[PDB]
Structures are given as structure tokens and as C-alpha cells.
Amino acid sequence: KLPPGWEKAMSRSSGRVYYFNHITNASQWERPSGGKNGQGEPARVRCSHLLVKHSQSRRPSSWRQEKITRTKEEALELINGYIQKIKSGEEDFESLASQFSDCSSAKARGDLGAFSRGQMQKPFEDASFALRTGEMSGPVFTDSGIHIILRTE
Numbered sequence: 001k002l003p004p005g006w007e008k009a010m011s012r013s014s015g016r017v018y019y020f021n022h023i024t025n026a027s028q029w030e031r032p033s034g035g036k037n038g039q040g041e042p043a044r045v046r047c048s049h050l051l052v053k054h055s056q057s058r059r060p061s062s063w064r065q066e067k068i069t070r071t072k073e074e075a076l077e078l079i080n081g082y083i084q085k086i087k088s089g090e091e092d093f094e095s096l097a098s099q100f101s102d103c104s105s106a107k108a109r110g111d112l113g114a115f116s117r118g119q120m121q122k123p124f125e126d127a128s129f130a131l132r133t134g135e136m137s138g139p140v141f142t143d144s145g146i147h148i149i150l151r152t153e
Contacts, residue, residue, distance in 0.1 A: 005130050006032045023130040024149075025138030041129045046114035046153035049105070049124070050097035052079050053145030062102035072146075079139050079146045086136065086148070093136070093150050102145060114153055124149060 002008070005023035010016050018029050053060065053068050054075035060068040070078070082100070085091045097103075097110025105112055117125060121142040131137055131151035140147040 001033065002031075003033050003130075003132075021130070021137075024127045024135075025140060026131075026136065027138060044114050044116045045128055045151060047112050047128045047131075047149050047151055048093065048097065048110040049103070049112065049140075049147045049149040050079075050082060050093065050101045050110050051103040051105075051145050051147050052082070052100065053102040057145045058143045063104065063106070064100070064102055068102070075146050076139060079148055082148060083138065093148075097148075110150070111152070 002019070005021045007020050007022065008018065009020055010018070016029075018027060019032055020027050021032075052075050053062060054070050054072045055068060056072060057068060062068065082096050086093055086096065094109035098106055100106070101110055103110075115128075117129060119125075120128070121144070123140055123142045124147060127137045127140045127147075127149055128151060131149065133151055133153060135151055137147075137149045140149060
């Protein structure tokens, strides 16, 4: 069973039976879906994301720091941290994207409004149409930087 991109397994050096998604990079214990087939995907969805850029980013520059000096590794250890707070509940997605998203959308809780399967970089797009209304993703790489997409519609 399991929807698109949902696989199971156990993480390294620790026996944990969980659910992974190679399209989203979303990880969780609970099972993703509970008999409905032929579904597929809508032809237009609405997201929000918190983009944190690094050096090998297309435009190594954003409204927060005129010249990005951090490295993928650094930018990644960074997104993880934000993922840490989102899931724990310490801070909420919006509040974070708002304060740190190296994307112009920060000034909008991180919203990007609904878009169709053609306007975004495949890595983002594929993770957006693979998320169900409400579900969030793990780290997603695009030539912009590392993302954290939140499906809102």
C-alpha cells in the first residue's frame, strides 16, 4: 500500500520501523494512508516554503544577507534545526519562514499561492504534488537552495 513515494524501513545505527518518502523526504512513525484508487493528483495546488540558501545556490544572495557565505552542509544542518522546531512545536512554520526564509516569500508567511505542474523547479513541484493538504516535507533541493515545503491547498 502507501501513497506515491511512501516506503518503509529503519534508520541507521538504531532499529526504528518507520515511513519514509523519497519524493518529499518526509519521515514519520504513523502510517501515511488508510480503499480508494485511481486518485492521482489535482491539477493545481497551493504551497508555502522556507528556503535557506548556501554558496552553490543560483543567486547566492537574499534580503537577509547581501552575500551568502554558508555552505550546503551548513545550510542543511540549518534546515534540519528548523524542522526540529516545527515538529516539536517550539515555533510554527510561518513564524520561521517569516524570520529566516532566504526567499522573497518570507514577507508572506512563506506563501507562494497555488501553482500548476509547470511553474516550479521539478524537485519542489514533485514534492508539492506528493504532499497531501496539510502534510509537510523534509529537505528539498533545488538550484535555489534547500527548501521546506508546506502544502496548504
